[PDB]
Amino acid sequence: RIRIDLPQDEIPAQWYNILPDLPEELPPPQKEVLPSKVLELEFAKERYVKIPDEVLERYLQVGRPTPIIRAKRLEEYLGNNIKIYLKMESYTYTGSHKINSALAHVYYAKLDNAKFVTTETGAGQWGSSVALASALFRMKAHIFMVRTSYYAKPYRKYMMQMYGAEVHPSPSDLTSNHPGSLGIAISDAVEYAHKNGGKYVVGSVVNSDIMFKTIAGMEAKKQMELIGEDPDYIIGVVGGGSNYAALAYPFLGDELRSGKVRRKYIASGSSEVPKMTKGVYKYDYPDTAKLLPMLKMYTIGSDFVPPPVYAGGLRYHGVAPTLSLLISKGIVQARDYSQEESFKWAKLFSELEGYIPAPETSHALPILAEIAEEAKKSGERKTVLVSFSGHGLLDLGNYASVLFK
Amino acid sequence: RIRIDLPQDEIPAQWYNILPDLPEELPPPQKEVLPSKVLELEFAKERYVKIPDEVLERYLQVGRPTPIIRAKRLEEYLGNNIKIYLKMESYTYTGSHKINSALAHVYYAKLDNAKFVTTETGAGQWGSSVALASALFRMKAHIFMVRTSYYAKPYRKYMMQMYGAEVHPSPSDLTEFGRQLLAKDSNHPGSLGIAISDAVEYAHKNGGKYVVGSVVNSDIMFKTIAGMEAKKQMELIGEDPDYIIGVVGGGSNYAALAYPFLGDELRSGKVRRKYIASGSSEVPKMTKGVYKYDYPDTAKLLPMLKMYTIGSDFVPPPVYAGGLRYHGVAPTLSLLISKGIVQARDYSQEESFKWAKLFSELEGYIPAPETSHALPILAEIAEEAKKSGERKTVLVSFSGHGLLDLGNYASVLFK
Ligand SMILES: *Cc1c(COP(=O)(O)O)cnc(C)c1O
Ligand SMILES: *Cc1c(COP(=O)(O)O)cnc(C)c1O
């Protein structure tokens, strides 16, 4: 009884849409390449949206529902002051939550009779997720991978290729050895989709994309209800915020409706990319390519470039608009930790629990230490539910660059 | 309804020992450093050996029981002539079945009050599994890794290090055997036999125990937790497999799945299911091995075993990347093959990796290169099943995922 399995025939059948439940309307922003039904869901007004049959089928295909695991050996290390439950989005075939939305974007593109889909990727997480979704929907995928990552971090490129996708170093020939960047790769992929009748699958922080990922939180609420455990804290890490919102919003939405928020919601980023603790809540460009409307979000600037030493994976400059609203209203609390502190926790967690977290995920572990410290003072036990967003088996080089000389 | 989970509170509590049920008497084999219980269990005569409670607990800790997944999209591709169930040993935290043995070996080392464990490793699959097992028992681990692999295949080294193991390039300066070889070449490339000799000496001289990753009977027995689980999972959905298939490195993953089923039939007096196992035609011990006593490890130490072998000095061509490099077949499995009870196949790495890619696109999960050699068997079964007029059920030992072996695939498939 470490693992809480949800049977596949009990998988939730709807996504959760937080918009009708937000304290106040979201600041408004300030269509040829996007799947049509995706743009439409960005304004959805109903609280629950049915997961299409074909999408749910492939959720089951890629390993959903994912388990919750109780991290009892970590609990002991922390003095048994808190109980720790991990929602294991790492258990999907691509090793993260990203496939939860990649599958939906590809489904809706297929419904627009897309000839192929395109997308950008840096280190390869989003690209490999889109490559898997495309294979399962029998769709041709053209992935534009920053040339530096295309050569430095080749394994996820090989993964995309095993799934049948064509991986193009950005900038490429279709379009001397310009190392590229993520913003060029977005333009590099958005153009190829525009001039060849493809659709662009957006790897950014829109509302529809959080909604698709909320299958994780819908499952977790069922699983926690299955063992009779109501979490006092829900925590996670913020690249753009989609993985954390996906877990928390199904729980938080019911609190917002009932009037009172009882649970504590805490999210972390990297202090080398400190949008969570040093970012400013204002309109900014959600992608470094500067196309896509501006939205009001916590941000350290779409032009921010992480230090070369940074290997923690939370490189994005901003926070999803709904999550930013929640933070500015005091509903979600913010933290930031260094990669040395986080990767030290990742190593400890690997030895204690046996499972190597993604470097991104490791930034949630210092939160647990803080909650345990407050519990020791209070001194009342608390239950924490963690978005365990990925595993680290394709990121061991990141860990090595910091931990192993 | 494609995944069959076995709840953790339903995990089997004993390992299966085929020795009392083998048809013929199996060739008897031909040690301050081995755990005492490991030596004892080689010759065990009971059918079932109780899994110690501390080992069971860590089975749960590393992801057991693993799921069976039905590969419906692959069934469709193949004409819906067969049902295909995959026992997913890839779902353990180290990505393969080797942890099922490593945990037992480390526990019995702890029971002997060992100060630490040692083992050898090449590509890193065994080293990673011992490193995790050791972490979960708070056992210090010293892993002696073939020096060339130490630098060439570093990701699995990093995995060992994340688990807190100390990784020593081999030959190392920590032993006399290693220091002597470094005196001739300060950067000696090492070998698996050299790494074995390193680990054994270090254990012997410093109060540790050596954890063996080879085809001894106890090792297969420890891995039978996967077959015990799979038998319960298949019975739970009313599916009796007609074929049980897998790949052969030394044969432990396949035996671990098959033996719990095969024992029942050996006891009934007649084998009705079909058992098919495959290797690499570049390392063709399965189809072209000589059946004789041979060294189970490449620089001796362990006693000789009677097995299908192509010689412990066999080295595969440098283009080979299928991962089934080992030169022999476990002795009990060798016996079964020689009696016609298990059928042998071998496939090229081009044919197997072609199937790996197809399977990755159809089902969305990247097999280990080693595992991919089971896939060609399915096309043979689909043909046979069509002739029967019934839809036949196949159970597959899905021994690992390929995420740490994607370079291997790229060398064959992507230029
Ligand atoms: C990309 C990534 C993240 C951050 O993404 P979000 O936009 O915050 O959801 C977190 N964990 C893993 C494993 C990732 O790959
Ligand atoms: C080592 C390995 C094998 C070979 O296993 P044997 O027990 O020796 O037959 C097969 N598959 C994977 C994934 C392996 O790592």
Swiss-Prot record, chain A:
**Pathway the protein acts in:** Amino-acid biosynthesis; L-tryptophan biosynthesis; L-tryptophan from chorismate: step 5/5
Keywords attached to this Swiss-Prot or TrEMBL record, sorted alphabetically, are: Amino-acid biosynthesis, Aromatic amino acid biosynthesis, Lyase, Pyridoxal phosphate, Tryptophan biosynthesis
**In its UniProt entry, what is this protein called?**
Tryptophan synthase beta chain 2
- PROSITE patterns membership: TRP_SYNTHASE_BETA (PS00168)
Q: What does this protein do?
A: The beta subunit is responsible for the synthesis of L-tryptophan from indole and L-serine.
Subunit structure, per the record? Answer: Tetramer of two alpha and two beta chains.
Q: Domain of life here? A: Archaea
Biological process per Gene Ontology, one example term: L-tryptophan biosynthetic process
* PANTHER family for the chain: TRYPTOPHAN SYNTHASE, TRYPTOPHAN SYNTHASE-RELATED
Q: Which reaction equations make up its catalytic activity?
A: (1S,2R)-1-C-(indol-3-yl)glycerol 3-phosphate + L-serine = D-glyceraldehyde 3-phosphate + L-tryptophan + H2O
Annotated SUPFAM superfamilies: Tryptophan synthase beta subunit-like PLP-dependent enzymes (SSF53686)
Could you give a GO molecular-function term held by this entry?
Answer: L-serine hydro-lyase (adding indole, L-tryptophan-forming) activity
One matching Pfam family: PALP
Coiled-coil portions: none
Cofactor(s) it depends on: pyridoxal 5'-phosphate
